[PDB]
Inverse folding.
């Protein structure tokens, strides 16, 4: 498995671009990640929210904004989407803060 | 309560917390099912938040043939989603 | 993370925290399965905490024919137990 | 559903007798209860233990001892057993403390 290295700071606003949406109407997005117990998991909807949207906001252009990256958001994220034709993506990014526990 | 026990028990609570608004108290109706899908798992629907896929999903889970999702049919849905997620992570390593 | 999501996620954690001692890392062996039953669900075993039933249970869960319990087969066990429990509570009110 | 009324006090040691075991070898005890979210749930074993025995101890004669009944143990318990022939019991007891939150 490959994951991009991203050096971050605790309490720093970071913006990430998560591509995957083709030139078609907004489909369902099965957001996932790779962690131990997994605390930062939440399925996102192009027409809905939930207990996660208040933490990470998704821009209409296909980007994730984190007001303050802490230690809970430190891990391997995977912005995956699911088309009704069997189409997804294995995009993985690993964020690492300077102040680790 | 053990860890695995808490996980299983939490599923029960979630169910009983949404089922009981109308129709029954131990069965999920179409209305309550929509609320559940628009709160617990909002994003698995291609219709976003519309009742389009909801009606179809209800008829997909309804195996008893009464248009009411029982825990017996609901647990299958939860299990399936979890299984697919883990299996994906298995291949995510390679 | 939503309530239902946390419940599903915890199941994955419990599994991954037991599978990986021997054999593989994403599959439960006979030895690991026993440890799981002797900790998470200790009491369902008719043999108390011995083997016997553990060996038979493994063969019951094993659907692929590898003598290893994969999450796809393990999730079914969890689902079945939870389903039976809820159904019991449903008829408990009467 | 029928449940016996048991008036208790917070921090009071209570002893409950749960019958169900016949004149046969100790079988599995599928302990359950009836609650909303259900916090005090744990499958008991005649040979094994777990996070619950530390709170409620099971006597070899078939009795449950609670060192100090609080507000978490206040509910409807159900001492149910399970034989390999399909035999259980519908015993329900409702405990109520004088100081309810």
């Amino acid at each position: 498995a490959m994951a991009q290295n991203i050096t971050a700071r605790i309490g720093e606003p970071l913006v990430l671009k998560c591509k995957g949406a083709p030139k078609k109407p907004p489909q369902r997005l099965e957001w996932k990640l790779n962690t131990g117990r997994t605390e930062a998991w939440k399925v996102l909807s192009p027409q809905g929210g939930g207990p996660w949207d208040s933490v990470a906001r998704v821009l209409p252009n296909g980007s994730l904004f984190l007001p303050a990256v802490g230690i809970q958001d430190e891990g391997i994220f995977r912005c995956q989407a699911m088309n009704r034709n069997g189409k997804e993506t294995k995009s993985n990014y690993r964020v690492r803060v300077y102040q680790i526990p | 309560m053990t860890e695995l026990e808490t996980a299983m028990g939490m599923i029960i609570d979630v169910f009983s917390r949404y089922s009981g608004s109308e129709g029954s108290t131990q069965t999920l109706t179409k209305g309550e099912l929509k609320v559940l899908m628009e709160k617990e798992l909002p994003g698995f629907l291609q219709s976003g938040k519309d009742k389009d896929a909801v009606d179809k999903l209800l008829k997909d889970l309804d195996a008893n043939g009464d248009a009411q999702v029982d825990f017996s049919e609901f647990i299958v849905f939860v299990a399936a989603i979890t299984s697919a997620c883990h299996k994906y992570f298995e291949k995510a390593g390679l």
User: Anything to note?
Assistant: The CA atoms of residues 74 and 99 of chain A lie 11 Å apart. The first strand of chain A starts at residue 4 and ends at 8. Strands of chain A lie at 4-8, 12-17, 32-34, 57-59, 63-69, 76-78, 93-97. The domain at 1-101 of chain A is CATH 2.60.40.10 (Immunoglobulin-like).
